[PDB]
């Protein structure tokens, strides 16, 4: 016969929305995908597709702390399949963190209450989607860099909730920018910086 097995199995995911893209583009062949947790009863999900991508979210979100393993079986199109395994995936430690967003902000006395949007995630506890903060808890610090337009030298403030109460100078322009950091991690620890935004 002749039907090529797979290569380039990549886990791609932001906020737990996980998809497995791979190669090569099917040349007169269909792939079927099997996903299991860490070493176990495999569960087929993407039946004899021709796409080189499989959205396995429903699976990974059942337990973001587990390390999933997967494989792609190559079946011959038209009138013992070959398979290649995916790398391990541990949702809680490798999903990229989507770019943050300052949700709003209004002065609370001699200070400026700043706030980050509590993003929603595919993670579903009970019949509910938990937020980013619902999933990570205190294991999610937001780093705010702010600085006054006037100068080039910045300032920083940390928070492990969603708002900051930063004092600022009376009648001055201050731009802001904030980054998400999961401290627990050893690799995808940070997100991209949220679009800078300024005051008056």
């Amino acid at each position, epitope marked *: 016969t002749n039907t090529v097995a797979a290569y380039n199995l990549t886990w791609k995911s932001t906020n737990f929305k996980t998809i497995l893209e791979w190669e090569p583009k099917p040349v007169n062949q269909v792939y079927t995908v099997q996903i299991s947790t860490k070493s176990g009863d495999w569960k087929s999900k993407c039946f004899y597709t021709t796409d080189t991508e499989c959205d396995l979210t429903d699976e990974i979100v059942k337990d973001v702390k587990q390390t999933y393993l997967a494989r792609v079986f190559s079946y011959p199109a038209g009138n013992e399949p070959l398979y290649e395994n995916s790398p391990e995936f541990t949702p809680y430690l490798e999903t990229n963190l989507g770019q943050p967003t300052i949700q709003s902000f209004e002065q609370v006395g001699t200070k400026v209450n700043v706030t980050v949007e509590d993003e929603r995630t595919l993670v579903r506890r009970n019949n509910t989607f938990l937020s980013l903060r619902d999933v990570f808890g205190k294991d999610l610090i937001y*780093t705010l*860099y702010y600085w006054k337009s006037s100068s080039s030298g*910045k*300032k920083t403030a*940390k*928070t492990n909730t969603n708002e900051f109460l930063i004092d600022v100078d009376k009648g001055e322009n201050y731009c802001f920018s904030v980054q998400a950091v999961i*401290p627990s991690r050893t690799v*995808n620890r940070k997100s991209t910086d949220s679009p800078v935004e300024c005051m008056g």
Partner: antibody, heavy 117, light 108 residues
Framework: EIQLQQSGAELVRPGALVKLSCKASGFNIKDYYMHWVKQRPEQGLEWIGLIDPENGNTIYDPKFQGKASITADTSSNTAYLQLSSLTSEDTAVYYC??????????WGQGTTLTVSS | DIKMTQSPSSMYASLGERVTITCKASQDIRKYLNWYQQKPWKSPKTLIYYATSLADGVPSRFSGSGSGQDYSLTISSLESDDTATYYCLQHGESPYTFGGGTKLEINR
């Protein structure tokens, strides 16, 4: 596994400028915030400044602005700290640390800068 | 800008004794207080972080309490390798400030 390396010793002539370095090993500095902490003889620790190797941002204690400048080469996984307009008052030991957000969880051994002729 | 005030500068105590070093910040730091131990000729070690969490293999006799402006590290049963210098470092917002530190000398 993880580790930060520093020059150990360094004698410098007053007025000159110097660039201590701190090489990172077993972690990527673009995932953390590198710090620099000075410490003079009969005195306690003093924060110099930080740097976010990621989106090249740096923060400085007021007291050092102009006197210092933390730089990082994300290729060679190295953070820097260049002092300037040197006076005897710069003679101290420089540590570079690693901030995981909750605390400085790795310290390079110290560099012992001596400004003299 | 945001000052830390650690007390006492030095303090002699005997083994098995309990000791309390203290740090007061001039404004709610929101438990972004860390206690550091420095043995002579040694990079500092991180004893307690986030006001009350024990860290990287710290002995259970170390503990810290705090909220807002009041923070304190306490060693229950003082021992030999506690002769060191302790610093509190607030790292809630720039600039990051270490307190003045205190030197525990063991009485024996």
């Amino acid at each position: 596994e993880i580790q930060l390396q520093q020059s150990g010793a360094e004698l410098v002539r007053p007025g000159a400028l110097v660039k201590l370095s701190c090489k990172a090993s077993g972690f990527n500095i673009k995932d953390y915030y590198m710090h620099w902490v000075k410490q003079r003889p009969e005195q306690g620790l003093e924060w110099i400044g930080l740097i976010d190797p990621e989106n090249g941002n740096t923060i400085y204690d007021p007291k050092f602005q102009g006197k210092a400048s933390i730089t990082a080469d994300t290729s060679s996984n190295t953070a820097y700290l260049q002092l300037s307009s040197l006076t005897s008052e710069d003679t101290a030991v420089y540590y570079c640390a690693r901030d995981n957000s909750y605390y400085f969880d790795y310290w390079g051994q110290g560099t012992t800068l001596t400004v003299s002729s | 800008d945001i000052k830390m005030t650690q007390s006492p500068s030095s303090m002699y105590a005997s083994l098995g004794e309990r000791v309390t070093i203290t740090c007061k910040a001039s404004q709610d730091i929101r438990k972004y207080l860390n206690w550091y131990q420095q043995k002579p000729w040694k990079s500092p070690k991180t004893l307690i972080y986030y006001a009350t969490s024990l860290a990287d293999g710290v002995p259970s006799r170390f503990s810290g309490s705090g909220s807002g402006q009041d923070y304190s590290l306490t060693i229950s049963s003082l021992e030999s390798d506690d002769t060191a210098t302790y610093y509190c470092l607030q790292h809630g917002e720039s600039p990051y400030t270490f307190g003045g530190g205190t030197k525990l000398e063991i009485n024996r």
